[PDB]
RNA sequence: GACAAUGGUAGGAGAGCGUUCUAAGGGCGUUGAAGCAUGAUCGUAAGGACAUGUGGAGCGCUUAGAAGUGAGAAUGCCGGUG
RNA sequence: UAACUUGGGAGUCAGAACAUGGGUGAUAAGGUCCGUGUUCGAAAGGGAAACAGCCCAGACCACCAGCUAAGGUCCCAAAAU
RNA sequence: ACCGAUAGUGAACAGUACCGUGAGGGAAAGGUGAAAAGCACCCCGGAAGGGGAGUGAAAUAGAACCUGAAACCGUGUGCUUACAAGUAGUCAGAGCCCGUUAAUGGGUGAUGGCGUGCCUUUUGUAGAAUGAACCGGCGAGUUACGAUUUGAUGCAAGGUU
């Protein structure tokens, strides 16, 4: 228990980020939004805090789906009432919800637990290219790739 | 700037007298005395007993005054239980436990 | 029919949160100094 | 044992149907009043070694009195009358520790007498040697007669 | 300043006045100990060494010759009445650093 | 010797095995006799022979 | 003779409901389920000593590839640099360097740039 | 000092811890024994101390000897209490 | 680096999967009976989501050191978007 | 080198109480204090029971009386807890509260990783196979006489009663 660094409320910085989602693929900005969220990215990166940054995505509408994934990929869910089954394609949910395509797919990639829920929370998915959170001065980050 | 007086070996239950005793924890003694006389409980007149017994004790043996005292303490603590059956059906017989309580009542001053 | 497992005391303790009576609805009497059930005559 | 205790007799319940561990009497070991298993039983503890071994012993033990200077030999002892005062004012001369073991050729009533109600000290005949006594003992105290007649015994 | 160190078959990040709990050392309290063993000197300037700094030394005073706490070595396998109970407490050399030596 | 200073010769005697009673022994519980059986009954096992 | 039970059930039951201190409920009161309780501590400690090592290795391998990719460069590639290069400097001392002095990390980043 | 070995059920082998009693020796105790309670103490384990509180009269230690000598389970027995 | 002989003391005589050579069954069975090998039994650790019997590999104890095995390196989740 | 109140007689105060038509079965239950000096008197209370005052070395030795463990039941509160999915711990770990047999301390614990009790019996049991409501006490390779083997010791063509 010799010498490694912890983070803590006190030392934890967390910036705000922008993302464009603009002809980027689905899962590929979901996974690097996913880092970005829990820090992942930071050196200072400690597990049982959250020392992630938040993240904005301006451009839901234009994400994009690969193959036929706009009529064939579906998402179901259930409401624990018998045969309470519903089902949505991948692309009537981007015509309808993209907020909610976008925002399903990176807590998907994120974990399970109360701090991962916490982390989940950070995010903040717009359909159209403006948003509102101008008074937390948003930086434009790049997609690595 | 504390008197007491106990009441050992009450034959009623220290969950029933509790509950009483739960009201009036705490507050000052006039209204304890009244919460006691209109609270419809078979505990009543016995834990109002006792709380007179420890204002008696406060004036008579401690030189207090009445009326700035308080049930800093009352509890009950559990007693001796009398154990005893009752006949049921098909010859068994099932026990039945009398139990009885030890009722404390300490009134303070507040020095 | 019987429980299959004996209960806790933070479960009892827990199912009892609301077990409780309340102090009675009284108010002073005027003329003796003293208190009464409210509605109710002495 | 179960056998010994008393009562127990007949068998407590049925074997099936009471819900009930099974039992065949009330004095059974595992009974508050039950039987003992196993526990004392009277015996004697005693047993022997051959008769060389007890000379050798004998042997031993009066050895390690002659070693370590803890023997001494008097001359006669000249007690008519039983006078304990007497006993320990000798002994006192004599110089002797706590612990004596005093050896006599035969029994002397009167040095008997004088000596056994001394703490630590203890009288014996020739014939009487034994290791517990010697060990015990820190000094010997042996009239001539009796050093004599013990190393004819003893060879 | 700081210094990287190899002592005990690990490595401690040191800095002059530093307090170390190292493996134990074959040395009485009170004595000065010398680690030849640099790997890298940060601070002002940069030494890296490759494996080691050539010329480097961390000197340091030997506070306590301890051991460590008291940690109780239990393990069982169910069911088979198989279990081993031992007692173990760490030897530990406690140091304070004194100079850094680039 | 002495009384309070007894030594019984070196190999001369050895502590008696006592079963059931513990694991660590290595002879608690079964006590040695292994598992079901005639053999592992009180009384049990066949004649010599 | 007889032996009686005595106190030394008393002394060891008590010991093990030391140990549970601290346990929800009944298992900081009952002995039965004390020393299971205090049972499965003992295994699960000598287990998670061991997997401490690899937790804590995982958490400087993190932080040295959030360093890497400041620099524009993997944690593989950076391992594979140093290595080629020669230095010796363990994980554990590589994140506290990334996080104390950017400086020395990213000379020792240029140096690993350099093996390759 | 330098090399090697040390997962383990049935089971074999070895070394020990602790309990009551006895012998001998040496000690403690109303200026407070045993027991009980608490503690952040010690030993590789079984376990051993110390301090404080309670308690109010017995009890350790060394060596050896002897056993009604160690319980968590037996739909175990008795008692107490959920 | 064992092997054998002589004595003291045992436990075991319900086995299981996998692979392979075969019988039986129906080139059915997580079937059954034999040969051969491994593992479980009596084996924790890593992998196969979870998963005695498969793959890697045999835990004296401690470490917030390092290199590898099977298996892996977009996120969950260490390592190649 | 027998027991010490679940032991030792079933019975330390009983072949009683109790059960059975009867033969018969058959318990539980010891301890104030050196001395009764066993609490005058006052106060609340019908009493019971208390608070004082006294006796006593001590009354939380006040008769349900030595010691007074655990289960279990309460009162107070230092830390914590009402978005959370759990064999309840363990490893990591801030924050808050304390301060020791002074030790790289104690209590609590946001949050993260890992994690299906024990025993028995089984090829294999988280097992929805067995057993245990909890706590405490009691509860199972013993002894005698022979046999054999090994260690020890004495003597040795002798050894031993
Ligand atoms: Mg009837
Ligand atoms: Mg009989
Ligand atoms: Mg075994
Ligand atoms: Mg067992
Ligand atoms: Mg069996
Ligand atoms: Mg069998
Ligand atoms: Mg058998
Ligand atoms: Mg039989
Ligand atoms: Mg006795
Ligand atoms: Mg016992
Ligand atoms: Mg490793
Ligand atoms: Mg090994
Ligand atoms: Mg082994
Ligand atoms: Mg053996
Ligand atoms: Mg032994
Ligand atoms: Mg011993
Ligand atoms: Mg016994
Ligand atoms: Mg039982
Ligand atoms: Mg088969
Ligand atoms: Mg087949
Ligand atoms: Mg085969
Ligand atoms: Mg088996
Ligand atoms: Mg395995
Ligand atoms: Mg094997
Ligand atoms: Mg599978
Ligand atoms: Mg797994
Ligand atoms: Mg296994
Ligand atoms: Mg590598
Ligand atoms: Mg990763
Ligand atoms: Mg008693
Ligand atoms: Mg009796
Ligand atoms: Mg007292
Ligand atoms: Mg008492
Ligand atoms: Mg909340
Ligand atoms: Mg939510
Ligand atoms: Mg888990
Ligand atoms: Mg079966
Ligand atoms: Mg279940
Ligand atoms: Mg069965
Ligand atoms: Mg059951
Ligand atoms: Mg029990
Ligand atoms: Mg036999
Ligand atoms: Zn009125």
């Known amino acids: 228990m010799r010498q490694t660094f912890m983070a803590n409320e006190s030392n934890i910085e967390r910036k705000w980020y922008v993302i464009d989602a603009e002809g980027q693929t689905l899962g590929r900005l979901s996974s690097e939004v996913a880092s970005i969220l829990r820090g992942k990215n930071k050196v200072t990166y400690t597990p049982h805090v959250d020392t992630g940054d938040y993240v904005i995505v301006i451009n839901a509408s234009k ?32 015509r309808t919800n993209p907020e909610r395509l976008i925002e399903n797919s990176i807590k998907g990639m994120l974990p399970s ?33 | 700037m504390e008197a007491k007086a106990v009441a050992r070996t009450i034959r009623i239950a220290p969950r029933k007298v509790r509950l009483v005793l739960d009201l009036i924890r705490g507050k000052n003694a006039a209204e304890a005395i009244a919460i006691l006389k209109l609270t419809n409980k078979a505990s009543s007149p016995v834990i109002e007993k006792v709380l007179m017994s420890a204002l008696a004790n406060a004036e008579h043996n401690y030189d207090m005054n009445t009326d700035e005292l308080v049930v800093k303490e009352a509890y009950a603590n559990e007693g001796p239980t009398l154990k005893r059956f009752r006949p049921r059906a098909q010859g068994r017989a099932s026990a039945i436990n009398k139990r009885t309580s030890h009722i404390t009542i300490v009134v303070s001053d507040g020095k | ?36 059930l409210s509605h109710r005559v002495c | 044992n179960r056998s010994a205790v008393s009562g127990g007799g007949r068998k407590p319940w049925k074997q099936k149907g009471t819900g009930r561990a099974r039992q065949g009497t009330i004095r059974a070991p595992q009974w508050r009043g039950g039987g003992i298993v196993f526990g004392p039983t009277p015996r004697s503890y005693a047993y022997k070694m051959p008769k060389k071994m007890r000379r050798l012993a004998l042997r031993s033990a009066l050895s390690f009195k002659a070693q370590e200077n803890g023997l001494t030999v008097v001359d006669a002892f000249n007690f008519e009358a039983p006078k304990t005062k007497e006993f320990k004012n000798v002994l006192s001369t004599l110089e002797q520790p706590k612990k004596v073991l005093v050896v006599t050729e035969n029994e002397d009533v009167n040095v008997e007498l004088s000596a056994r109600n001394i703490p630590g000290v203890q009288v014996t005949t020739a014939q009487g040697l034994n290791v517990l006594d010697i060990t015990n003992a820190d000094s010997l105290v042996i009239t001539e007669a009796a050093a004599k007649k013990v190393e004819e015994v003893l060879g | 300043m700081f210094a990287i160190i190899e002592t005990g078959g690990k490595q401690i990040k040191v800095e002059e006045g530093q307090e170390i709990f190292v493996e134990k050392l074959d040395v009485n309290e009170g004595d000065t100990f010398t680690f030849d063993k640099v790997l890298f000197v940060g601070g002002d300037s940069v030494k890296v060494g490759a494996p080691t700094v050539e010329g480097a030394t961390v000197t340091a005073t030997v506070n306590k010759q301890g051991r460590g706490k008291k940690i109780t070595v239990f393990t069982y396998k169910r069911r088979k009445n198989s279990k081993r109970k031992k007692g173990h407490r760490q030897p530990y050399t406690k140091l304070t650093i004194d100079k850094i030596n680039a | 010797m002495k009384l309070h200073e007894l030594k019984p010769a070196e190999g001369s005697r050895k502590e008696r095995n006592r079963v059931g009673r513990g694991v660590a022994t290595g002879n608690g519980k079964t006590s040695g006799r292994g598992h079901k059986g005639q053999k592992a009954r009180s009384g049990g096992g066949v004649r010599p022979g | ?107 020792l980043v240029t140096k690993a740039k350099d093996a390759l």
């Not at chain 3, 005391?9 to 199912?15: L, S």
């Not at chain 3, 609301?18 to 208190?35: A, D």
């Open chain 1, 113 to 145: 637990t109360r701090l991962g829920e916490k982390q989940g929370k950070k995010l903040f998915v717009y359909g159209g290219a403006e948003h509102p959170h101008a008074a937390q001065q948003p930086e434009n980050y790049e997609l690595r790739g």
């Open chain 1, 63 to 94: 994400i994009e789906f690969t193959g036929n994934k706009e009529t064939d990929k579906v998402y179901y869910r259930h409401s624990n009432h018998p045969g309470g089954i519903k089902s949505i394609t991948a692309g009537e949910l981007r």
């Open chain 7, 1 to 107: 003779p007889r032996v009686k039970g005595g106190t030394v059930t008393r002394a060891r039951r008590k010991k093990t409901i030391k140990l549970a201190k601290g346990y929800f409920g009944s298992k900081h009161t009952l002995y039965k389920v004390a020393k299971q309780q205090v049972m499965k501590s003992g295994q699960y400690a000598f287990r998670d000593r061991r997997q401490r090592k690899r937790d804590f290795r995982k958490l400087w391998i993190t932080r040295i590839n959030a360093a890497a990719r400041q620099h524009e460069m993997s944690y593989s590639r950076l391992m594979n640099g140093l290595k080629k290069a020669g230095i010796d400097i363990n994980r554990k001392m590589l994140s506290e360097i990334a996080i104390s002095d950017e400086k020395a990390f990213a000379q």
């Open chain 3, 1 to 36: 029919a019987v429980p299959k497992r004996r209960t806790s005391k933070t479960r009892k303790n827990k199912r009892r949160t609301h077990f409780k009576i309340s102090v009675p609805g009284m108010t002073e009497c005027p003329n003796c100094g003293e208190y009464k």
